[PDB]
Structure formats: C-alpha cells, structure tokens
C-alpha cells in the first residue's frame with residue numbers, strides 16, 4: 579500500500595550490488611527509518627524472486643527487540659523497496675575494528691541478546707545465520723539487532739559448523755555453533771578457525787582444532803568449549819547458555 583512519495587530521502591548508508599540503503603523519513607509522522615532499494619534487474623539477473631518472496635512475509639510477522647524490524651514493502655515495476663528499522667550506532671563489525679576486542683561484560687551481554695533472539699526464532703520455527711559481526715547492528719543505547727543483511731554494503735567458511743560444510747543434514751543446533759564462534763571472536767578479535775587458506779580452515783573446523791590466548795578466563799573457555807562440539811546433539815540448549823555461570827556473572831541484560 580506504501581508509495582515512494584510517502585518518504586523523504588537522506589544520505590546513502592550503504593551501496594551494494596543488489597541496491598542501496600538510504601536514511602529516510604516518513605512524511606506524515608517525521609519518523610526516521612531505513613529504506614532499501616533493490617533493482618529488479620539484478621534480481622532478474624539471478625534467481626531469487628521466490629527467495630525474496632520468502633524472507634519478507636517471514637520478517638513481517640516477526641516482532642522482537644533484538645531483531646531488526648521490517649515494517650513494510652512495495653514496488654514500482656523496476657525496483658523493490660524495503661522499509662526497515664533504523665539502527666543509529668551501526669555494525670558490531672565496525673565496533674570490533676575500533677576496539678580490537680571486547681571485554682567480558684560487553685561480550686556476555688551480546689551473547690545474551692543473541693541467545694534471546696535465536697530462541698524466539700526457534701519458537702516461530704526459524705533458523706537464521708550466519709550472525710556474522712557485519713550482520714549485527716546496534717540500536718541507540720548500544721543493544722544488538724540481528725539484521726539478516728542484504729549485502730548492499732571471512733569467507734564465509736569461518737562461521738559454518740562441520741555438518742553444513744561436509745554435506746550432511748542440519749538442524750537448530752547450527753545456531754549454537756555460530757554462537758560459540760562469535761563468543762570467541764568478541765573476546766579475541768578473530769574467529770577461532772581463521773587461516774591463510776580455505777583448506778587449513780576446513781581442516782580446523784571439521785577436526786575442531788582451536789586454542790585460547792592466555793587472557794581468556796576459565797568461565798569463558800568453558801562456555802566456548804561447550805558450544806564448539808562436532809556432534810550437534812552434544813551442543814547445549816539456548817536455555818542453558820542463558821543460565822551459564824559466566825553469562826549470569828558478566829551480562830548486564832537479564833535473560
């Protein structure tokens with residue numbers, strides 16, 4: 579029902595391949611938000627029309643504080659427009675470049691917010707990803723928000739669990755593996771399986787080979803070792819992560 583004439587456009591927040599993201603403002607309420615413009619050309623060049631169909635109807639019927647909200651959408655027969663929540667503080671990725679690594683307080687809270695978001699997703703029968711730092715945005719108070727970034731703004735091997743790479747079947751447990759890769763990146767400043775080649779990285783993931791720098795504490799080492807298990811069924815539940823000693827002792831956001 580929306581139309582482009584309903585919005586004022588500000589500066590470009592990101593130019594990508596499929597399109598751009600602009601700062602915008604609904605004319606009636608003066609509400610600030612983000613507007614994605616997707617080119618039907620590039621959508622036509624590839625085959626995602628059905629894939630585009632999916633995400634939208636889902637994200638629409640999806641309301642949670644740690645999940646970027648999608649408000650609406652519309653088209654003009656050459657372009658596709660998405661209306662999203664605007665997240666003023668930017669990307670967790672850029673923060674990690676600025677600070678190098680996070681402290682246990684900051685990390686424990688991020689993990690808490692991610693676990694809550696993921697647990698909501700599971701309840702609505704949904705499995706997301708790859709929750710890479712570049713797909714994690716920040717609200718005005720500093721609170722994390724899962725975007726499921728369109729790449730309108732690594733490799734992606736570093737965040738995939740063993741079962742997904744090797745060709746085997748996978749379930750909700752893939753999210754617990756991601757959570758542990760992320761927890762480690764937050765405290766150390768790089769993912770635990772990073773390497774100069776795709777081959778070595780593969781090898782380290784499938785064989786779960788990684789180590790800690792001295793400064794990582796035992797309660798941290800403990801939670802990460804429990805998420806990073808080759809056998810998916812041996813990975814904890816989201817619920818047990820929220821109640822972990824290291825989490826409860828360092829997180830400022832309640833479960």
Ligand SMILES: CC(C)n1nc(-c2ccc(NC(=O)/C=C/C(=O)c3ccc(F)c(C(F)(F)F)c3)cc2)c2c(N)ncnc21
Pocket residue numbers: 591592596599612614616626627629630631633634646662663664665666668669715725726727728729730731
């Ligand atoms: C750069 C800055 C930091 N930035 N970026 C955002 C931002 C956050 C989320 C999105 N959402 C999407 O892109 C969704 C795309 C798709 O569902 C999709 C579906 C089917 C496809 F085939 C595809 C395709 F990619 F294959 F085409 C995509 C977009 C921008 C943002 C924000 N909301 N607030 C503040 N700053 C912000």
Ligand SMILES: [Cl-]
Pocket residue numbers: 784785786808
């Ligand atoms: Cl092993």
